[PDB]
């Protein structure tokens, strides 16, 4: 994806895929060129070292990233635990807020305060349903201004 400003912000799976396709494309040139066997042994053992840094990086020399000094992130490091699975064990969530709490000792046991500035942004789409059912706004864009 292109960052704002002219510079691109790639993943680091494009460095490990662009290295399996070079050492594999050069190994086809080296075999149709009839190289001595001392060279096409350094290409087979050099190809399959780039493929084993793709799947799980670290069980070997830990092929550090280019243009930096930290190790790349292989495929088995995205699945591998961060203390949680990749899927749901994490789910950031819509329709939510957060703020500081205070005392308010006038309440019952089954209620709580909630500011008018969070009740109008948490419950926004519930409001566009009333402002058109009650007949005040005409369309749903014209109601988006009355809530502003």
């Amino acid at each position: 994806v292109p960052l704002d400003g002219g510079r691109f912000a790639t993943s680091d799976l494009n460095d490990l895929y662009r290295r399996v396709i070079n050492r594999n494309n050069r190994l086809k040139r080296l075999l149709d060129l009839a190289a001595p066997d001392i060279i096409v042994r350094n290409e087979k053992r050099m190809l399959q070292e780039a493929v084993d840094a793709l799947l799980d990086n670290g069980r070997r020399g830990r092929a550090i990233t280019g243009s930096n000094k930290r190790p790349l992130k292989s495929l088995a490091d995205m699945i591998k635990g961060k203390q949680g699975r990749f899927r749901q064990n994490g789910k950031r969530v819509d329709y939510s807020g957060r703020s500081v709490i205070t005392v308010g000792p006038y309440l019952r046991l089954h209620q709580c305060g909630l500011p008018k500035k969070m009740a109008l942004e948490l419950f926004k789409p519930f409001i566009y349903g009333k402002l058109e059912l009650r007949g005040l706004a005409t369309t749903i864009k014209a109601a988006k201004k009355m809530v502003e």
Binding site: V1, L3, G6, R7, F8, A9, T10, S11, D12, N14, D15, R18, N22, R23, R26, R29, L30, L33, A34, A35, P36, I38, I39, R41, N42, E43, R45, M46, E49, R60, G61, A63, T65, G66, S67, N68, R70, K73, T138, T139, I140, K141, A142, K144
Partner: protein, 472 residues
Amino acid sequence: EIGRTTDPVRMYMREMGTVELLTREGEIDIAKRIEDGINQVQCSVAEYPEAITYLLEQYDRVEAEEARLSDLITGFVDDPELAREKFAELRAQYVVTRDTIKATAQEEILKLSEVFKQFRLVPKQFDYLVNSMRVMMDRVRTQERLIMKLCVEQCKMPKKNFITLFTGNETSDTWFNAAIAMNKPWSEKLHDVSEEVHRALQKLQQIEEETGLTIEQVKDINRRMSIGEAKARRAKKEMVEANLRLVISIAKKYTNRGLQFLDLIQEGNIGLMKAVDKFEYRRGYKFSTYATWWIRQAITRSIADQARTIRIPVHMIETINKLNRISRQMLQEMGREPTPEELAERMLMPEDKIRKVLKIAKEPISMETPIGDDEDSHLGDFIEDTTLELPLDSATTESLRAATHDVLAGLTAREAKVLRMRFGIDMNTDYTLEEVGKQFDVTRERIRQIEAKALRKLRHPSRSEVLRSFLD
């Protein structure tokens, strides 16, 4: 000694340090063989007359423009100026040689074949000769395999005696009358498939008739040519395996440019194999001053082409390098630094291309770089995506189908029909106003005006009263 070492650098370095460096006499002594390695090839092709037909007509194709004047010849050994005089002497002898074979029945073609070496060739017209004649052995070699494939694989023929009578021979009737005569069990069975194994071996005689020579002529030419051919690879393997230490020193200056250390020395060897290919010692210059160019050339030609994520060409790469060599002299001379107004004069560019070359160089960030303070979060959680669309615009375009299904529903039977047809509402691709009429049959100013007055009716307010609110 095999000490559980993993990294492929140490495993390649020691695997190279077995061979020992060559002397100044070893090079010419090794290279001396390569000339002999080709010398047994060029003599092994002249007696196969099929090359001349391909290239002797190449001069007819040259003056008639069915080929060029350079990619067939490069000057006889020991262009129109020199080719026309001698190339006719190819034919000037050609009419001489072929008449004896219609004694010296073979020597006359030898008189031309012994002398065909004196017509130098370029690689483009070279590979076809070695390819065509080697193509013929592709077929007739399995023909002998075919004769085994039917005779012994069907009729239990003895493969121990028929071989010597028919190993490469392919032209006689040895197991047609001689083998069958003994009255063995394989003998009487062979005549059932006798003609099939003969019609299949008719191609080989047709092939040797396609060349004018015999399979003995055909085989040994494509048998000896491979003899002197492998004698070269034994040599090129010898000189390349020695100088592999030369590549590690040249390919170490370019170490930190985004291309790994091993991807360099494996890119040099692919060039060094070309230096030994093109080397010619009769200039008298030593090898290291010659292969050091082809090696250092390929190690930098590859850094330009395959070390950037977003690939920039090799002619643009030379301009950026030319813009830092000159952006340094402006630094250590002017003191502070240069400006993109002042680089217009140091270099000689139009001052607007230099503003395009400046923002091409920068390579992409990685989406795992930990953000400032090194929090428990990376830069990949802060780039939102824009292919999506707001669920309030998706809730509006579903509300436009409700109105136009209504506001159009207030119109007549077909005065709404043209509106769904002339525009693309509720259909596939809309139609042409004269194409619209092909459903009504009246293609005229009526139909192209029916839409206007009708859609003018909706313009009458309190009908488009609701639709007016969908603009902004």
